[PDB]
Amino acid sequence: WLDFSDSASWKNLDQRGGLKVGTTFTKEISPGYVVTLTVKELKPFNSTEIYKKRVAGTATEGTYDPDAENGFLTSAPYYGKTPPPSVTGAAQQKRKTQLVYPMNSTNWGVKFDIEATYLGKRVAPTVVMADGEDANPGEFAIFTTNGTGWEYMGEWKMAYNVITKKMLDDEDVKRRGLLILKDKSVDWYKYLSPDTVTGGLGSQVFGPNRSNERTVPVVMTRGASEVGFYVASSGQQAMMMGFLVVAVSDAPESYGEAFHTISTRDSVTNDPINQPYLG
């Protein structure tokens, strides 16, 4: 994974230390093997020929804008009130390998020319890409290539779910209006993959998707006669409750009324960022 935080790897940055057309990133990633990235374009997906073809002949054909610029969602309060950020790697270890557009509520893109050399000779590179952040159904990251069509390599720890129109519309109703869908300058349904099964494997466009493997922490209490579950959420949470019976043999009849009637014992106050030591 490239370390975009290494400031000496960058040349020809803008006034704010961010990318412009002609910015380069160069790294000798292995002895003799040099990769050079050059910024060719800084434009969002609604400016691409890919998007032009997806909206052709529909009600939203006019949303194709080849002159579109990186910036805020037009529904955001930032739009027109504050300059948008620059694309940057400048930490400003998970962060080090990320290239970001460091404000919320945006529609942006970058296209890089890539060159790899091995002992000074040009070679065909093998490029891997991922979104380092989590994505809900209204959060889109799309990958394009002019090389081989995308091949799934596996999961990187910090098969998956392709975002569909139904998932996006369900998320819109659930949140009572996603900010992104309030931007009427783009047809967001045409950001979604045409391939609802694999999200673009074996094509030159991958995503947008969301990772599908989550876990939940499990806790245990023994000798309870009362358990409570409390929720406050803009969404929904859900109770799971189970019982273990493997050790019933030597289980007591009860932990006792004396134990059960003590007031609920709250957790100790422990905040090491506030108070590093007990003494």
Name residues contacting a copy of itself, limited to 37-66 (CB under 8 A): 37, 40-41, 44-45, 48-50, 53-54
Residues 111/21/88/28 CA torsion (nearest 10 deg):
80
Q: Which of 98, 137, 163, 168 lies at the binding interface for a copy of itself (CB under 8 A)?
A: 98
Site for a copy of itself in 182-211 (CB under 8 A): 186, 188, 191, 193-201, 203-206, 209, 211
Minimum gap (Å) between residue 278 Cβ and a copy of itself: 12
Minimum gap (Å) between residue 169 Cβ and a copy of itself: 13
Site for a copy of itself in 143-182 (CB under 8 A): 143-160, 164, 166, 174, 176, 178-180
Q: Does 90 bind a copy of itself (CB under 8 A)?
A: no
Structure tokens at 198: 């694999």
Q: Does 19 bind a copy of itself (CB under 8 A)?
A: no
Cα–Cα dist 227/220, whole Å: 11
Upper half-sphere CA count for residue 102 (Cβ side, 13 Å): 14
Q: Do 211 and 161 meet the contact criterion of CB atoms below 8 Å apart?
A: yes
Q: Which of 97, 106, 165 is nearest to 137 (CA)?
A: 165
Cα–Cα dist 29/6, whole Å: 12
Q: Does 134 bind a copy of itself (CB under 8 A)?
A: yes
> Residue 147: CB partners within 8 Å, gap ≥ 6?
124, 127, 204
Q: Which of 59, 120, 213, 277 lies at the binding interface for a copy of itself (CB under 8 A)?
A: 213
Residues 50/54/57/61 CA torsion (nearest 10 deg):
-70
Minimum gap (Å) between residue 12 Cβ and a copy of itself: 18
Q: Does 141 bind a copy of itself (CB under 8 A)?
A: yes
Count the site residues for a copy of itself by CB under 8 A: 157
Cα–Cα dist 273/271, whole Å: 6
Q: Which is nearer to a copy of itself, 83 or 123 (CB)?
A: 123
Site for a copy of itself in 224-253 (CB under 8 A): 224-245, 247-248, 251-253
